[PDB]
Design an enzyme around this catalytic site. Structure first.
Site, PDB file in Angstrom:
ATOM      1  N   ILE A   1     -10.831  -1.321   6.399  1.00 43.03           N
ATOM      2  CA  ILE A   1      -9.665  -2.147   6.095  1.00 43.03           C
ATOM      3  C   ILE A   1      -8.394  -1.526   6.669  1.00 43.03           C
ATOM      4  O   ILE A   1      -7.596  -2.205   7.319  1.00 43.03           O
ATOM      5  CB  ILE A   1      -9.552  -2.355   4.570  1.00 43.03           C
ATOM      6  CG1 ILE A   1     -10.659  -3.288   4.074  1.00 43.03           C
ATOM      7  CG2 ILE A   1      -8.189  -2.913   4.190  1.00 43.03           C
ATOM      8  CD1 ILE A   1     -10.845  -3.248   2.543  1.00 43.03           C
TER       9      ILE A   1
ATOM     10  N   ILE B   1     -16.790  -6.083   1.753  1.00 45.40           N
ATOM     11  CA  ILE B   1     -16.501  -6.167   3.180  1.00 45.40           C
ATOM     12  C   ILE B   1     -17.522  -5.307   3.906  1.00 45.40           C
ATOM     13  O   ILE B   1     -17.717  -4.138   3.551  1.00 45.40           O
ATOM     14  CB  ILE B   1     -15.062  -5.711   3.489  1.00 45.40           C
ATOM     15  CG1 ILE B   1     -14.052  -6.741   2.978  1.00 45.40           C
ATOM     16  CG2 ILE B   1     -14.884  -5.491   4.982  1.00 45.40           C
ATOM     17  CD1 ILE B   1     -13.626  -6.529   1.540  1.00 45.40           C
TER      18      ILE B   1
ATOM     19  N   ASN C   1      -3.511   2.217   1.384  1.00 44.94           N
ATOM     20  CA  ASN C   1      -4.908   1.830   1.483  1.00 44.94           C
ATOM     21  C   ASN C   1      -5.856   2.956   1.099  1.00 44.94           C
ATOM     22  O   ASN C   1      -6.952   2.680   0.608  1.00 44.94           O
ATOM     23  CB  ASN C   1      -5.205   1.328   2.909  1.00 44.94           C
ATOM     24  CG  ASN C   1      -6.675   1.112   3.164  1.00 44.94           C
ATOM     25  OD1 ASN C   1      -7.285   0.190   2.611  1.00 44.94           O
ATOM     26  ND2 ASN C   1      -7.268   1.976   3.991  1.00 44.94           N
TER      27      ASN C   1
ATOM     28  N   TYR D   1     -13.250   4.424 -12.327  1.00 42.69           N
ATOM     29  CA  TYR D   1     -12.918   3.591 -11.178  1.00 42.69           C
ATOM     30  C   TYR D   1     -12.225   2.299 -11.607  1.00 42.69           C
ATOM     31  O   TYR D   1     -11.199   1.915 -11.035  1.00 42.69           O
ATOM     32  CB  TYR D   1     -14.183   3.297 -10.373  1.00 42.69           C
ATOM     33  CG  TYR D   1     -13.911   2.588  -9.069  1.00 42.69           C
ATOM     34  CD1 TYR D   1     -13.182   3.215  -8.065  1.00 42.69           C
ATOM     35  CD2 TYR D   1     -14.366   1.292  -8.847  1.00 42.69           C
ATOM     36  CE1 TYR D   1     -12.927   2.577  -6.864  1.00 42.69           C
ATOM     37  CE2 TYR D   1     -14.111   0.646  -7.645  1.00 42.69           C
ATOM     38  CZ  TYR D   1     -13.385   1.301  -6.660  1.00 42.69           C
ATOM     39  OH  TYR D   1     -13.111   0.688  -5.461  1.00 42.69           O
TER      40      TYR D   1
ATOM     41  N   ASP E   1      -4.541   9.268   8.084  1.00 44.12           N
ATOM     42  CA  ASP E   1      -5.870   9.358   7.496  1.00 44.12           C
ATOM     43  C   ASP E   1      -6.114  10.788   7.046  1.00 44.12           C
ATOM     44  O   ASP E   1      -5.510  11.732   7.558  1.00 44.12           O
ATOM     45  CB  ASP E   1      -6.970   8.939   8.475  1.00 44.12           C
ATOM     46  CG  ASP E   1      -8.256   8.581   7.769  1.00 44.12           C
ATOM     47  OD1 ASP E   1      -8.399   7.402   7.380  1.00 44.12           O
ATOM     48  OD2 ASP E   1      -9.129   9.471   7.596  1.00 44.12           O
TER      49      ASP E   1
ATOM     50  N   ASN F   1     -12.185  -6.573 -13.439  1.00 41.82           N
ATOM     51  CA  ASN F   1     -13.512  -6.801 -13.980  1.00 41.82           C
ATOM     52  C   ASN F   1     -13.832  -5.778 -15.056  1.00 41.82           C
ATOM     53  O   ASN F   1     -13.134  -4.780 -15.244  1.00 41.82           O
ATOM     54  CB  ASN F   1     -14.563  -6.747 -12.867  1.00 41.82           C
ATOM     55  CG  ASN F   1     -14.821  -8.105 -12.262  1.00 41.82           C
ATOM     56  OD1 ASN F   1     -15.569  -8.911 -12.813  1.00 41.82           O
ATOM     57  ND2 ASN F   1     -14.181  -8.380 -11.137  1.00 41.82           N
TER      58      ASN F   1
ATOM     59  N   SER G   1      -8.841  -3.016  -6.085  1.00 35.32           N
ATOM     60  CA  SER G   1     -10.280  -3.238  -6.113  1.00 35.32           C
ATOM     61  C   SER G   1     -10.535  -4.334  -7.129  1.00 35.32           C
ATOM     62  O   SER G   1      -9.784  -4.470  -8.099  1.00 35.32           O
ATOM     63  CB  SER G   1     -11.041  -1.954  -6.501  1.00 35.32           C
ATOM     64  OG  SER G   1     -12.385  -2.219  -6.868  1.00 35.32           O
TER      65      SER G   1
ATOM     66  N   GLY H   1     -13.684   6.347  -4.997  1.00 34.32           N
ATOM     67  CA  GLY H   1     -14.390   6.424  -6.263  1.00 34.32           C
ATOM     68  C   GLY H   1     -15.500   5.387  -6.347  1.00 34.32           C
ATOM     69  O   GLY H   1     -15.866   4.735  -5.363  1.00 34.32           O
TER      70      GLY H   1
ATOM     71  N   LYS I   1      -8.101   1.617 -10.954  1.00 33.93           N
ATOM     72  CA  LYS I   1      -7.697   0.494 -10.116  1.00 33.93           C
ATOM     73  C   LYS I   1      -6.946  -0.569 -10.922  1.00 33.93           C
ATOM     74  O   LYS I   1      -6.045  -1.224 -10.391  1.00 33.93           O
ATOM     75  CB  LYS I   1      -8.917  -0.104  -9.416  1.00 33.93           C
ATOM     76  CG  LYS I   1      -9.558   0.810  -8.347  1.00 33.93           C
ATOM     77  CD  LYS I   1      -8.636   0.984  -7.130  1.00 33.93           C
ATOM     78  CE  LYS I   1      -9.343   1.694  -5.967  1.00 33.93           C
ATOM     79  NZ  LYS I   1      -8.540   1.588  -4.711  1.00 33.93           N
TER      80      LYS I   1
HETATM   81  N1  LIG Z   1     -14.317  -1.699  -5.003  1.00 35.99           N
HETATM   82  C1  LIG Z   1     -13.941  -2.636  -4.144  1.00 35.99           C
HETATM   83  O1  LIG Z   1     -14.018  -3.824  -4.416  1.00 35.99           O
HETATM   84  C2  LIG Z   1     -13.419  -2.182  -2.813  1.00 35.99           C
HETATM   85  C3  LIG Z   1     -14.117  -2.469  -1.652  1.00 35.99           C
HETATM   86  C4  LIG Z   1     -13.614  -2.023  -0.440  1.00 35.99           C
HETATM   87  C5  LIG Z   1     -12.432  -1.298  -0.428  1.00 35.99           C
HETATM   88  N2  LIG Z   1     -11.780  -1.029  -1.563  1.00 35.99           N
HETATM   89  C6  LIG Z   1     -10.539  -0.273  -1.506  1.00 35.99           C
HETATM   90  O2  LIG Z   1      -9.970  -0.436  -0.212  1.00 35.99           O
HETATM   91  C7  LIG Z   1      -9.433   0.796   0.268  1.00 35.99           C
HETATM   92  C8  LIG Z   1     -10.115   1.207   1.573  1.00 35.99           C
HETATM   93  O3  LIG Z   1     -11.514   1.393   1.377  1.00 35.99           O
HETATM   94  P1  LIG Z   1     -12.583   1.247   2.567  1.00 35.99           P
HETATM   95  O4  LIG Z   1     -13.834   0.660   1.980  1.00 35.99           O
HETATM   96  O5  LIG Z   1     -11.938   0.580   3.749  1.00 35.99           O
HETATM   97  O6  LIG Z   1     -12.888   2.783   2.875  1.00 35.99           O
HETATM   98  P2  LIG Z   1     -13.556   3.340   4.229  1.00 35.99           P
HETATM   99  O7  LIG Z   1     -14.501   4.418   3.785  1.00 35.99           O
HETATM  100  O8  LIG Z   1     -14.005   2.222   5.129  1.00 35.99           O
HETATM  101  O9  LIG Z   1     -12.293   4.044   4.912  1.00 35.99           O
HETATM  102  C9  LIG Z   1     -11.425   4.809   4.097  1.00 35.99           C
HETATM  103  C10 LIG Z   1     -10.539   5.674   4.964  1.00 35.99           C
HETATM  104  O10 LIG Z   1      -9.626   6.360   4.115  1.00 35.99           O
HETATM  105  C11 LIG Z   1      -9.657   7.746   4.420  1.00 35.99           C
HETATM  106  N3  LIG Z   1      -9.393   8.582   3.233  1.00 35.99           N
HETATM  107  C12 LIG Z   1     -10.251   8.936   2.267  1.00 35.99           C
HETATM  108  N4  LIG Z   1      -9.646   9.727   1.345  1.00 35.99           N
HETATM  109  C13 LIG Z   1      -8.374   9.890   1.732  1.00 35.99           C
HETATM  110  C14 LIG Z   1      -7.188  10.615   1.230  1.00 35.99           C
HETATM  111  N5  LIG Z   1      -7.243  11.341   0.094  1.00 35.99           N
HETATM  112  N6  LIG Z   1      -6.055  10.523   1.949  1.00 35.99           N
HETATM  113  C15 LIG Z   1      -6.000   9.803   3.076  1.00 35.99           C
HETATM  114  N7  LIG Z   1      -7.023   9.118   3.603  1.00 35.99           N
HETATM  115  C16 LIG Z   1      -8.216   9.132   2.981  1.00 35.99           C
HETATM  116  C17 LIG Z   1     -11.039   8.010   4.981  1.00 35.99           C
HETATM  117  O11 LIG Z   1     -11.055   9.141   5.846  1.00 35.99           O
HETATM  118  C18 LIG Z   1     -11.348   6.717   5.702  1.00 35.99           C
HETATM  119  O12 LIG Z   1     -10.947   6.769   7.066  1.00 35.99           O
HETATM  120  C19 LIG Z   1      -9.630   1.799  -0.852  1.00 35.99           C
HETATM  121  O13 LIG Z   1      -8.442   1.897  -1.633  1.00 35.99           O
HETATM  122  C20 LIG Z   1     -10.769   1.220  -1.661  1.00 35.99           C
HETATM  123  O14 LIG Z   1     -10.752   1.657  -3.019  1.00 35.99           O
HETATM  124  C21 LIG Z   1     -12.238  -1.449  -2.743  1.00 35.99           C
END
Ligand SMILES: NC(=O)c1ccc[n+]([C@@H]2O[C@H](COP(=O)([O-])OP(=O)(O)OC[C@H]3O[C@@H](n4cnc5c(N)ncnc54)[C@H](O)[C@@H]3O)[C@@H](O)[C@H]2O)c1
Ligand SMILES: NC(=O)c1ccc[n+]([C@@H]2O[C@H](COP(=O)([O-])OP(=O)(O)OC[C@H]3O[C@@H](n4cnc5c(N)ncnc54)[C@H](O)[C@@H]3O)[C@@H](O)[C@H]2O)c1
Lengths: 237, 237
Positions: A19, A188, A91, A155, A38, A147, A142, A95, A159
């Site tokens: 994302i 996603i 972003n 988690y 990142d 939910n 999230s 967790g 959130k």
């Molecule tokens: N539970 C859900 O419904 C859901 C689903 C997808 C994403 N999300 C949320 O969207 C956001 C992105 O998630 P994603 O699935 O794209 O993750 P991802 O694993 O695809 O990418 C996450 C990126 O963030 C970086 N990252 C991790 N910890 C970090 C930190 N402490 N500081 C800086 N960067 C850091 C990682 O290196 C990685 O490049 C998050 O906040 C996640 O909680 C939630």
């Protein structure tokens, strides 16, 4: 059109993949200068380089969002490189399912990573946004935040706190010309997930990035304090 | 870009003035052929003529959304004029503060006007949207749907049913390729209002129309079942 980010300067965290990567590239295409950050310094550089190769303006930096020195370096690098800050996309987060009897450090980590970080980055960015005449903050939450389920003590609660922080700080920073909204992303990128998704397909990173672009653009200039769920119509986390 | 409505055919109800008029003109500028409808036949025709004079495609028709014969005629006229239906904006609605001891005819009228109408129009449009390859329904609700206050028995409850209908029927028509969302407007056009409005200004029809365009465009193709409040950050009705 109001759906562009002309002359914007956007900081995006967790932007090396998924994302955050899609938002960084989409925001640059819409006219923003992008500060790509990142946890992984090489991943952020890769995305900033790809944005530059495609014609956009971007720099990439390492930033662990839970590290106050890293946070301050990102703010300074945005100002040094581009002279202002008008958009912040929180972003970085993480967790997942954990047992009720998890170690307390696991429970506290979820709040440091998902909540204390962005809040502090919001604090750091807001005075510069005000001096630039306004801006937009966008938090990636999230669906666990609205939910209720098993194994969600850390988690889901952290959130949910992101969602409620979004709604509340909109009151604090509105008078500074700053909007604050959140996106709750669905799944996603299988048959099980599709049974709970009315639109019948998994989400794409671009789906979140298109909604992010709307909420951070002048087309949403009077929208603040909202949590927008992008889930294909589904409600289950 | 994903924020355009090329080759779309949009029905907009209550579109002779205010929010509906702004949606109609915005959707036409974005590429849609628009069926402008209103209780007032001549008001709808004036808006369609201004759209044509600005270089868009539109017809104007009379339609009391509470009248089943009018609802069927609007569906048929959209298909006769433009050959398909892909977007339906249920903007017609009304009501307001009423005493708790109101006549039952007033209580039931709020549901006939604000809810039964849009449910039926959604029923009539949905099979045509599926044959056209998919579509989007947008319901214009009210912040009274989620707020609580005195004198809100009919207006608040009926607009809340619109919000919940939106979330539920997204599950039913999602598999037909149809998204259903709602916008809950705040104070769309004083000191008291601004005191509870973080962004410091009253809402404009174009604020709603910009959000409507987003939610009915390919930029929101994986967004369904949402209720987006457009209120300047405010939470009070
Ligand atoms: N539970 C859900 O419904 C859901 C689903 C997808 C994403 N999300 C949320 O969207 C956001 C992105 O998630 P994603 O699935 O794209 O993750 P991802 O694993 O695809 O990418 C996450 C990126 O963030 C970086 N990252 C991790 N910890 C970090 C930190 N402490 N500081 C800086 N960067 C850091 C990682 O290196 C990685 O490049 C998050 O906040 C996640 O909680 C939630
Ligand atoms: N409570 C709120 O916070 C709030 C604020 C603004 C708008 N809204 C909602 O937005 C929608 C439009 O409001 P507006 O302020 O733009 O209204 P408006 O008064 O500016 O115009 C509404 C239009 O709808 C038409 N109309 C009225 N009754 C109709 C019927 N039975 N069938 C067809 N058309 C009809 C009118 O002729 C008029 O042209 C409504 O659903 C309203 O409830 C809610």
């Amino acid at each position: 059109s109001p759906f562009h980010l002309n002359d914007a300067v956007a900081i995006v965290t967790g932007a090396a993949a998924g994302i955050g990567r899609a938002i960084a590239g989409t925001f640059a295409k819409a006219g923003a200068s992008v500060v790509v950050t990142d946890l992984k310094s090489e991943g952020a550089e890769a995305v900033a380089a790809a944005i530059r190769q495609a014609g956009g303006k971007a720099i990439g930096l390492e930033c662990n969002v839970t590290d106050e020195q890293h946070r301050e370096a990102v703010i300074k690098a945005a100002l040094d490189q581009f002279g202002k800050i008008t958009v912040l996309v929180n972003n970085a987060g993480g967790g997942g399912p954990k047992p009720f009897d998890m170690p307390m450090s696991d429970f506290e980590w979820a709040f440091k990573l998902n909540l204390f970080s962005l809040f502090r980055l919001s604090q750091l960015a807001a005075p510069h946004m005000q001096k630039a005449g306004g801006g937009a903050i966008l938090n990636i939450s999230s669906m666990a935040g609205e939910n209720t389920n098993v194994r969600m003590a850390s988690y889901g609660s952290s959130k949910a706190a992101v969602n409620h922080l979004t709604r509340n700080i909109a009151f604090d920073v509105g008078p500074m010309g700053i909007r604050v909204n959140a996106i709750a992303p669905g799944a996603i990128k299988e048959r099980a997930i599709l049974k709970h998704t009315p639109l019948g397909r998994l989400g794409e990173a671009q789906d979140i990035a298109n909604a992010a672009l709307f909420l951070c653009s002048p087309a949403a200039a009077w929208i603040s304090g909202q949590v927008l769920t992008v889930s294909g119509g589904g409600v289950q986390e």
